Symmetry: D2
Subunit: 121 residues, 4 copies
């Protein structure tokens, strides 16, 4: 739980509050500073609870469906990446945002990007 | 769509995706990959839009598997991002990101991307 | 030049007319059945002119900037994939569409998708 | 932006991206990768928006490298998709797709995805 558990911020100022359970579980809340989002959204994910000891990062991923008590933007984002420990701990991710879409709009249903999370900002 | 998404799905690789869609918007179940450094079942967790649009749009969803179970650890995780489409054959169309634990020397090559489409029909 | 050179169609009905030069060059035109596009757009790309002989595909990629005489949608798409020969020849790709964007919109500037090209439809 | 995009660029890996932006919207030059199964320079070709927006938007562009030259063939190709931003430090922000020649058994693992950001300052 040690390294991952806590509050993280990405380059957009979004706020990633996560708890890494002993079984490999990620649970918490996400607050996006961008897009059709307000307040907190439930997140869930998984991480490698027994990572390699050769200096490589700890692989992980999590999902947010963009529905909460206030808004439903009919979309979901998954972050795929890894936690790296050290003087400047970091969660480096790439992400996919899929929106509900008709057949005619399916080609344009998915964003890709990359978020870097640190414990500052 | 609880009753629609809940069930056993298969992708074009023959992988098996056993999922339950709770009322809260949660996805829980197991994933068995027919490809790569995997064997037997792995825990998955995810989220879905529990109140989708009624205009004919699909139902957005995602889920994550960390490739560690009691038999194997491939020090990697895959996230699938996509949507459920109901109808004559319900389908789940995804794109996915597989990130492997990497060093600074290897980090540029840490992530695969691909696309899986799931149906309920056994291969 | 043999296998790749010709007219190809993807699952959206877009039309991919390409010539594969002996030096590894891809040149031709693209006509998209989707998005802010009309008529033909210039494409250029590269392919492995000496691929492996173990049965694997021939890696390739090409770019379209979405500006022609009629329209400019301030965006560019790159397809990355490979040509596979056989009874049903195929060009299997994934693609990235980046749109010109401000700092506030950068997070949402890029689509990802996948196109499969065959010599029918 | 012809004079802006034309020049020698470096990404966060130390790779060298020598490009000329023609008036037609074309990109031509050479790429030297600091990472992976590459050595010396490879041909690149691409396209860019020769008439970008004046609202503060970046200039969209893309280019392709096939990883074969006179010294090496890694049976793969990378496409970079991104945009040029001018200013105090001009920057080219990209995401990229590297596809390797694959078999049916290997096809699910054929494609890396990543992101490179280029400046003109030597590492
Ligand atoms: O804006 C949101 C939800 C908030 C997303 C926030 C994103 S998550 C990755 C990035 N990192 C963050 O921290 N924040 C941003 N959803 C819209 C997106 C645009 N939409 C479409 C529609 C059709 N096709 C494609 C896209 C409609 C739904
Ligand atoms: O093979 C697995 C675990 C099984 C994943 C199965 C994949 S999930 C998406 C697709 N859909 C499925 O149903 N099945 C496949 N994991 C890594 C280990 C090390 N790997 C890398 C890659 C890049 N850099 C470094 C190391 C390669 C793959
Ligand atoms: O529609 C086009 C150009 C035509 C693209 C056609 C695409 S190429 C991949 C797919 N395969 C095809 O055969 N056809 C489609 N460009 C728009 C896209 C939406 N735009 C934004 C703006 C801001 N952020 C993200 C996206 C504005 C520019
Ligand atoms: O290493 C290279 C050629 C050099 C590419 C350099 C890359 S371009 C994006 C990034 N930005 C840079 O500046 N440099 C790097 N090519 C393949 C060969 C076989 N590979 C696979 C992968 C997946 N499946 C099967 C085989 C791994 C990589």
């Amino acid at each position: 739980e040690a390294g991952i558990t806590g509050t993280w911020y990405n380059q957009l100022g979004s706020t990633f509050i996560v708890t890494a359970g002993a079984d490999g579980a990620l649970t918490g809340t996400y607050e996006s500073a961008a897009g059709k989002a307000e307040s907190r959204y439930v997140l869930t994910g998984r991480y490698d609870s027994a990572p390699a000891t050769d200096g490589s990062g700890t692989a992980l991923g999590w999902t947010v469906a963009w529905k909460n008590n206030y808004r439903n933007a009919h979309s979901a984002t998954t972050w795929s990446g890894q936690y790296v420990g050290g003087a400047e701990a970091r969660i480096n991710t790439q992400w996919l945002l899929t929106a509900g879409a008709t057949e005619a709009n399916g080609w344009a249903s998915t964003y890709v990007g990359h978020d870097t999370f640190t414990k500052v900002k």
